[PDB]
Design a protein around this ligand. Structure first.
Ligand SMILES: *CC(=O)Nc1ccc(NC(=O)C*)cc1
Lengths: 510, 85, 13
């Protein structure tokens, strides 16, 4: 039955703001039953007055009864469209500003149901004042309320970079961090982390979250039991560690990712070595802390038990390259790879079926592993020289197709790294016999014409490391090198004015 | 990189006039090149050979005559009369 | 030629 709604309609529009309180006191009361609830939904003339009384009242019981009535309609289906076709969205979001707790649990919920169980609201809320009021109400002392508020931010900023930017200018990241750093409720932390991820992929919010302190705070909950929260934190940092190279506080964060390398979840390790691969590219003391928590043994073990899976070995080799290059703990990090039996596997990654982007990082790890002379012999025993030459051969016999990426490797980089690694390996005299015996000298001379200033740095450098033995010296002075090196002594970088002259010093002298 | 040489080598650096007791490899390769050039140990005909038959270098190194650019040997001949720090 | 020698000597350190 209807037959009572126009009777209930005009009384709310009474200009006496006292009878309205005595009118809506029973509408919220009459909306509790499923029976009389259907009567209010079927009448847009009735709902069009509850909306007005909400955005136009000075009383408290009226706002609680009005917005409380709209919550009782959100559970039912055709009670949402009436709220949406009566223009309720701009009014509900308004009540996200009037300070009162009793209306917010009724307003932020009625909006939450509208964001999911009815289309269009995800666009109307963005237009009509939403993300402003939602982010502004993140400082409430309640926790369950924030579980609904933060979840509405995930629905609106989802794949919509307009909304993603909107939350940014409101001081969004700085406020979302203080929620993970403080509260302990799993459902809120799972949602807040679920929001920070769809804020990380946009390269505008990426430094802002780091700047506030997102990394150091997200690592606190890496030990929490719920894996639905754990991998979301790791997924965030993986996308969010690109711009976190220049700040401290990660002391415990590095003493936790290492233990995750010994985890039975393959997707966790992949999202753990990729973090250390990025958090060790430029920082000095970061590499110290990794070495100081046993980072080598736990990381070397990962490449062993991960197999030809390049997706795990690619960040792991880069991480070892960083810890072994240019810092105080270099002599040890180049040594702990040998003591923990990591040398043989690294040479195996050179051979197929390893793709090129991994090989590019491995041939660059060899030049760091060969700095400590205690690794010259084991590399020769594992067949490093005959393999590095093989990759060097094809890399030149592929970029020589000038007569004419996608894989991700500029083929001039493999030549830049292989001839750079051999320059370090050519220090042990036994390597200088193998490199000479493989018939490689007449190849470095052709590389000496490369217009790359990094090819000439190592090509005219590895020949300098071969110039000691006269058995190779006067052999080089025959197959070219006499004329092309003559005017390498005026190139700009002082790394090529030398070297290229260091070769000429021993050849055609006496 | 800092190294503290053994006193049987310090006499060479103290001869040109060394003051410190520890040096960088830049300074050791500097004070040593000053001695060969002061005491005249190169062969001025073709100058990439250094002679040290009955000299301090002939006692420190062990070879009566070494070339200038044999590198690793010179790098290691120095690397026995020092204790790295 | 000796002065231009020991400089390239201490270049690979
Ligand atoms: C680095 C280098 O070897 N420079 C060099 C050495 C010798 C000459 N030799 C003469 O001048 C006789 C030129 C450059």
């Amino acid at each position: 039955a209807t037959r009572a709604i126009p009777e209930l309609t005009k009384l709310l529009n009474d200009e006496d703001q006292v009878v309205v309180n005595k009118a809506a006191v029973m509408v919220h009361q009459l909306s509790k039953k499923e029976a009389s609830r259907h009567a209010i939904m079927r009448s847009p003339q009735m709902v069009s007055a509850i909306v007005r009384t909400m955005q136009n009242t000075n009383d408290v019981e009226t706002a609680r009864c009005t917005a409380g009535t709209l919550h009782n309609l959100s559970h039912h289906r055709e009670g949402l469209l009436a709220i949406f076709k009566s223009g309720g969205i701009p009014a509900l979001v308004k009540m996200l500003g009037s300070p009162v707790d009793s209306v917010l649990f009724y307003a932020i919920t009625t909006l939450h149901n509208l964001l999911l169980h009815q289309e269009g609201a995800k666009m109307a809320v963005r237009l009509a004042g939403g993300l402003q009021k939602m982010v502004a109400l993140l400082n409430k002392t309640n926790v369950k309320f924030l579980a609904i508020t933060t979840d509405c931010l995930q629905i609106l900023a989802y794949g919509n970079q307009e909304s993603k930017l909107i939350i940014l200018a409101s001081g969004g990241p700085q406020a979302l961090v203080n929620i993970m750093r403080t509260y302990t409720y799993e459902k809120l932390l799972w949602t807040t982390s679920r929001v920070l991820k769809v804020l990380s992929v946009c390269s505008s919010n990426k430094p802002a979250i780091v700047e506030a302190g997102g990394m150091q705070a997200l690592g606190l909950h890496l030990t929490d039991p719920s894996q639905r929260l754990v991998q979301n934190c790791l997924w965030t940092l993986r996308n969010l560690s690109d711009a976190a190279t220049k700040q401290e506080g990660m002391e415990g964060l590095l003493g936790t990712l290492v233990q995750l390398l010994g985890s039975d979840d393959i997707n966790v390790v992949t999202c753990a070595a990729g973090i250390l691969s990025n958090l060790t590219c430029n920082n000095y003391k970061n590499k110290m802390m990794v070495c100081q928590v046993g980072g080598i043994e736990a990381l070397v073990r990962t490449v062993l038990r991960a197999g030809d899976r390049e997706d795990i070995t690619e960040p792991a080799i880069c991480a070892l390259r960083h810890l072994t290059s240019r810092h105080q703990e270099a002599e040890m990090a180049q040594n702990a790879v040998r003591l923990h039996y990591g040398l043989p596997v690294v040479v195996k990654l050179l051979h197929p079926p390893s793709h090129w982007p991994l090989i590019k990082a491995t041939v660059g790890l060899i030049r760091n592993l060969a700095l400590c002379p205690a690794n010259h012999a084991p590399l020769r025993e594992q067949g490093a020289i005959p393999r590095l030459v093989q990759l060097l051969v094809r890399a030149h016999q592929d970029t020589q197709r000038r007569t004419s990426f996608v894989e991700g490797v500029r083929m001039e980089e493999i030549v830049e790294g292989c001839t750079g690694a051999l320059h370090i390996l050519a220090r042990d005299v036994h390597n200088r016999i193998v490199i000479r015996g493989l018939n490689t000298i007449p190849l470095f001379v052709q590389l000496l014409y490369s217009p790359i200033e990094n090819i000439q740095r190592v090509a005219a450098g590895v020949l300098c490391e071969l110039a000691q033995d006269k058995e190779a010296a006067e052999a080089i002075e025959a197959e070219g090198a006499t004329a092309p090196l003559t005017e390498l002594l005026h190139s700009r970088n002082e790394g090529v004015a030398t070297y290229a002259a260091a070769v000429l010093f021993r050849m055609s002298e006496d | 990189t800092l190294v503290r040489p053994k006193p049987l080598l310090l006499k060479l650096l103290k001869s040109v006039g060394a003051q410190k007791d520890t040096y960088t490899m830049k300074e050791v390769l500097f004070y040593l090149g000053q001695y060969i050039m002061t005491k005249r140990l190169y062969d001025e005909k073709q100058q990439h050979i250094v002679y040290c038959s009955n000299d301090l270098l002939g006692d420190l190194f062990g070879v009566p005559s070494f070339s200038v650019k044999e590198h690793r040997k010179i790098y290691t001949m120095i690397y026995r009369n020092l204790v790295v720090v | 030629c000796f002065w231009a020698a020991w400089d390239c000597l201490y270049f690979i350190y």
